[PDB]
From a paper:
Spike protein–dependent viral entry is initiated by upward movement of the receptor-binding domain (RBD) at the apex of the protein allowing access to bind the angiotensin-converting enzyme 2 (ACE2) cellular receptor. Upon receptor engagement, coordinated proteolytic cleavage, shedding of the S1 subunit, and conformational rearrangement of the S2 subunit lead to viral fusion with the cell and transfer of genetic material. Given the critical nature of the RBD interaction with ACE2 for viral entry, antibodies that bind the RBD and interfere with ACE2 binding can have potent neutralizing activity, some of which have progressed to clinical study.
LY-CoV555 had substantially (>10-fold) greater neutralization potency relative to other identified RBD-binding and ACE2-blocking antibodies, such as Ab128 and Ab133, despite having similar apparent binding affinities, suggesting a distinct binding mode of recognition. Structural information was used to map the portion of the RBD molecular surface that interacts with ACE2 only, LY-CoV555 only, or both.
Author numbering:
A (entry chain C): 334 to 528
B (entry chain B): 1 to 211
C (entry chain A): 1 to 129, 133 to 213
The structure:
Amino acid sequence: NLCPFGEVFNATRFASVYAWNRKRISNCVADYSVLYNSASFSTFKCYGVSPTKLNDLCFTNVYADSFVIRGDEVRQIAPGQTGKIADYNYKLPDDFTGCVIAWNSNNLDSKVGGNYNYLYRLFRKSNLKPFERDISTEIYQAGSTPCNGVEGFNCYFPLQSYGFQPTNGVGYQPYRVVVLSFELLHAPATVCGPH
Amino acid sequence: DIQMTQSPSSLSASVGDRVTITCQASQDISNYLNWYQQKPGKAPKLLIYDASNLETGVPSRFSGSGSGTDFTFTISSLQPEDIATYYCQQYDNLPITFGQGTRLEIKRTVAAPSVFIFPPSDEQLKSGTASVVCLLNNFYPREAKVQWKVDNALQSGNSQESVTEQDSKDSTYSLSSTLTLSKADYEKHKVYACEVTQGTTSVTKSFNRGE
Amino acid sequence: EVQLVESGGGLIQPGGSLRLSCAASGLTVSSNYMSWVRQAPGKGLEWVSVIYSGGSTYYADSVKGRFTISRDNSKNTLYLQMNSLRAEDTAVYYCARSPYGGNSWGQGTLVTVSSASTKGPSVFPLAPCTSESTAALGCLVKDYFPEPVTVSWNSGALTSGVHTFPAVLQSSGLYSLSSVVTVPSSSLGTKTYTCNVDHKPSNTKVDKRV
Ligand SMILES: *[C@@H]1O[C@H](CO)[C@@H](O)[C@H](O)[C@H]1NC(C)=O
Ligand code: PRO
């Protein structure tokens, strides 16, 4: 059984970053060469492992987290980074073991007239913990007066749309991101490289 | 960094004129651009947010347009109270960056200054310095010659001038000139005169130190 | 509804430290994106620093490693700690809600970085030597440092006809400005006139009848 990376990387649709998707990868042979050897990926950054050595290693499980952000935010998907995405949407731990893979998805995720279906969280009182997800849509209280669920002055809907049009600057173009995290618990190693 | 190039640096226009300022971003900023009005000695006030949206309370003569790199700000019919410096700002990318500003000046009809002259106070003379002040009140244009005369002798490089911000009701300027002398020199002379030249007319206000 | 009031401005020696305060009402500082922006005399606007609600902080390259942004929740106050100050840091410093949320700015506070000493102003009457139907009275604000001073008349009750001039840097290194008011000559013996002068950098207020 080959690991279902096809379903991860070649999926028709991707998650918004605030509602980022996680897929557990288990009980399979993981050929990482189809990935690291590819010209398809403009980010391929590995932490606590060497990408060239991936086909040699076994892990308890692999998790594939996936979502869309804009080009200029891809740098935030790395350990020790801060910003609206890292702080309020998707957070890697300082001691991350895994790989960050990204590619430009302008051709799929932009639309003439703008694609507004991808959202991120703009307002949040505190930073996310690593691998935390917040899909809440409570009106954000920016003053001393309670909002009572009503959008207005000092009372902000917490989510904002990206506006992806194909002729956007690359900083404003959509990028698909896949985060592979590797766990090596005191348990059987179910995900092994072919070699 | 994203650079914001603003045009023009300064413009001069009449009341009622349509005024157009451009801003160009060095890379895509979507519609995340703000326009501010700054009147001297005050904070910038937001006029237009997200390229085209009128801030609540702002007159409808103000408008903006654009998306991407090219932006315009328009005053449909310039009012006297629109004398200010105008700034564009891109806010969605760090570092946040502003245009260099457009200083907006008003053209109007010529106006003759009301001229006043003030002798040094007794209080100040005790200190051992004499300041003589000449005031040019509510005039246009900006440019006027102010000359100091002490017993009909033309002073040079011992006075300083400052001009007020262009008035927001009547579009006139005002100028104060201060002549600075030692106490010894002030008592050496009798007649102190400030000469104001606009065009081919000169107006001189004076006082006699004795009287 | 929102009020942002900056304070802490004044003269500080090169290499000195200064902490600015921004007291907020009508928003919660710790719940918002809050920025400092500065404006050097007669120059443009320069963004300095931001703090996010979650606590992330960012700095303009020009202030990197010297300035720290912070807040106190209980006082509902934003701070800017300025260390290792240089002449180029001379500016009006503004606090603002920026870059997201309702657009609000404070009135600003002027910071002067100079090797000189603080000097309070001398206030002298500017008075004419039957008068013309329009008479002028004034106040000369001599030999002060640093900027700025503010002038009002009769505790701000008189505003019509007032021209408070910009200051000039005299060759001695001290500032001087004038404030004049034109009034009807018939009131010169009935009404009373006083210039109210404030030099906050020296903590001095001068009220002088003319
Ligand atoms: C996705 O599909 C392409 C074309 O069929 C294939 O070359 C590629 O390796 C697939 N990606 C993965 C991760 O299996
Ligand atoms: O897996 C791959 O090779 C393709 C390349 C872009 C989308 N995923």
